[PDB]
């Protein structure tokens, strides 16, 4: 009936910021109920967030109300989430579904998010340089 798409997973260091988001497609947000869960290596998922149309009453998993923020666009099908104060716990598969109840079906594709310290390697050998070239 509905199904959801979620992505834009990155790699940041404990203590960072990480924009992800789901481009839903069957409904609309300022309408029905959403929420963004995680699921880290096998675990069994687990709802993160939770955002409700109208008035703006949210609710997390209670461990994640000062970790993470779940919002979304009343005209725009996307469901966003900031990923900060990070602890080795975010490292892991993100999805956003609606609420039907009390729990996540989660039909989004996976958003491979992960946490690690000193990655700021990309191979260049060529200097990066800055803005002293623009060719």
């Known amino acids: 009936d509905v199904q959801l798409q979620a992505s834009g997973g990155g790699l940041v260091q404990p203590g960072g910021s990480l924009r992800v988001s789901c481009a839903a497609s069957?409904?609309?947000?300022?309408?029905?109920?959403m929420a963004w869960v995680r699921q880290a290596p096998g675990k069994g998922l687990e709802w993160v967030s939770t955002?409700?149309?109208?008035?703006?009453?949210?609710y997390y998993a209670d461990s994640v109300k000062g970790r993470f923020t779940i919002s979304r666009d009343n005209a725009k099908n996307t469901l966003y989430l900031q990923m900060n104060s990070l602890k080795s716990e975010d490292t892991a598969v993100y999805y956003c579904?609606?609420?039907?109840?009390?729990?996540?079906?989660?039909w989004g594709q996976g958003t491979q998010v992960t946490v690690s310290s000193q990655s700021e390697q990309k191979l260049i050998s060529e200097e990066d340089l800055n803005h002293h070239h623009h060719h």
């Open positions: 579904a609606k609420y039907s109840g009390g729990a996540l079906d989660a």
């Open positions: 069957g409904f609309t947000f300022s309408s029905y109920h």
């Open positions: 955002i409700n149309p109208g008035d703006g009453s949210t």
